[PDB]
Amino acid sequence: KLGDICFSLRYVPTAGKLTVVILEAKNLKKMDVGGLSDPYVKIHLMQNGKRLKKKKTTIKKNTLNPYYNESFSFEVPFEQIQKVQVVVTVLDYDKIGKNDAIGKVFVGYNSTGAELRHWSDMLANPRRPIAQWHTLQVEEEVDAMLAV
Ligand SMILES: [Ca+2]
Ligand SMILES: [Ca+2]
């Protein structure tokens, strides 16, 4: 498995500002042989399949069920909040070597089910934040979904 990461959402149309708040990851896969992991979360703002912004949170050295509660801000127009998708990706850090991909979640157009409901709930609450548990899925499949 990959695990599950909880993150919040908060759109402000009055100003046209998108907000993504990282909360915590759990059941994260072990990337270190017989050891722990160093998973962190990242956020990417894509336009119906077009990379626009890239963000990353702190790194929880040696762990698999760490907390974050980080607040990120984006600049998405009230007319784009529906055409954009916030992708929450969790990657494992490895000092020198490259960072392994634990998994990644996505919310927005291409999204569906609990993911689409969250993004929609966000727009429904253009003032109050929306937190929910997002189960990290295979990044490759995730990228395949965004691809039309
Ligand atoms: Ca590793
Ligand atoms: Ca590691």
Side-chain angles (χ1 to χ4, degrees), residues 77-92:
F78 180 38
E79 64 203 323
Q80 234 153 27
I81 172 82
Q82 293 141 15
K83 279 193 62 160
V84 301
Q85 320 187 54
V86 180
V87 215
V88 183
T89 315
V90 184
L91 297 102
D92 163 60

Side-chain angles (χ1 to χ4, degrees), residues 94-132:
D94 281 308
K95 187 168 208 94
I96 296 95
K98 202 162 173 82
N99 32 93
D100 317 340
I102 291 250
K104 94 192 234 111
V105 245
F106 64 106
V107 291
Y109 230 111
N110 275 217
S111 311
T112 53
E115 321 229 46
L116 176 74
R117 91 161 290 160
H118 190 184
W119 189 250
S120 133
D121 211 26
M122 173 210 272
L123 278 137
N125 291 247
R127 314 281 174 72
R128 174 97 91 68
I130 307 253
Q132 228 240 116

Side-chain angles (χ1 to χ4, degrees), residues 130-141:
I130 307 253
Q132 228 240 116
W133 273 106
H134 280 275
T135 301
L136 297 174
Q137 259 161 55
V138 178
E139 265 162 49
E140 291 223 51
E141 317 181 35

Side-chain angles (χ1 to χ4, degrees), residues 25-82:
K26 70 178 180 165
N27 285 303
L28 301 168
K29 191 222 231 223
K30 265 166 157 141
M31 317 318 262
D32 305 336
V33 188
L36 280 186
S37 309
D38 309 276
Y40 53 103
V41 184
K42 288 202 233 243
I43 300 91
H44 295 82
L45 181 73
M46 319 221 309
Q47 261 266 262
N48 57 79
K50 299 133 114 256
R51 253 226 289 190
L52 323 175
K53 321 228 138 224
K54 72 286 123 158
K55 307 268 183 171
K56 65 142 239 299
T57 76
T58 184
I59 304 127
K60 310 281 102 211
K61 309 252 127 254
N62 45 263
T63 175
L64 324 162
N65 313 263
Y67 230 79
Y68 295 105
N69 189 253
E70 277 186 27
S71 333
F72 282 87
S73 81
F74 284 75
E75 276 192 51
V76 164
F78 180 38
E79 64 203 323
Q80 234 153 27
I81 172 82
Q82 293 141 15

